[PDB]
């Protein structure tokens, strides 16, 4: 579920330093995880973006299947691969920079 994806993203992201005090909360705030803590900080916003990306892939499968092309399933393994890539890229780029 979106809630389970949210907890997975939060638990995997919490191991890396990403908190910034200077964040401006948008008025619209497109929410994907219901019962999200309002107002959200940076970590809540990025985990919401992560679950949005996962659900965007899930919707793109349906969009392609309406046309009738070949589709491959997106899975919790896809989500874990994405979060692992995010953590690795974040750490690598910050250290290099």
């Amino acid at each position: 579920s979106t809630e389970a994806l949210y907890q997975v993203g939060k638990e995997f992201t919490s191991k890396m330093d990403l908190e910034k005090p200077n964040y401006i909360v948008p008025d619209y705030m497109p929410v994907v995880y219901d019962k999200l803590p309002q107002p959200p900080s940076h970590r809540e916003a990025i985990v919401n973006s992560c679950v949005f990306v996962h659900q965007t892939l899930h919707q793109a499968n349906a969009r392609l299947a309406k046309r009738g092309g070949r589709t491959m399933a997106i899975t919790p393994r896809h989500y874990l691969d994405f979060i692992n890539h995010y953590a690795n890229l974040f750490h690598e780029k910050r250290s290099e920079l």
Partner: protein, 49 residues
């Protein structure tokens, strides 16, 4: 060379806050956009942006 290095310092201070979103987009692209063609990859990247 310091004509480049001096402005590179302010660019450092600029993307110090911008690393997170770029890494998020790059990780999403690498993890998800492998199977799709160019148009669908661009559509997914535009939606994430």
């Amino acid at each position: 060379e310091r004509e480049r290095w001096e402005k590179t310092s302010e660019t450092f201070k600029n993307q110090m806050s911008t690393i997170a979103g770029d890494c998020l987009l790059s990780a999403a692209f690498i993890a998800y956009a492998g199977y799709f063609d160019q148009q669908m990859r661009q559509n997914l990247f535009t939606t994430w942006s």
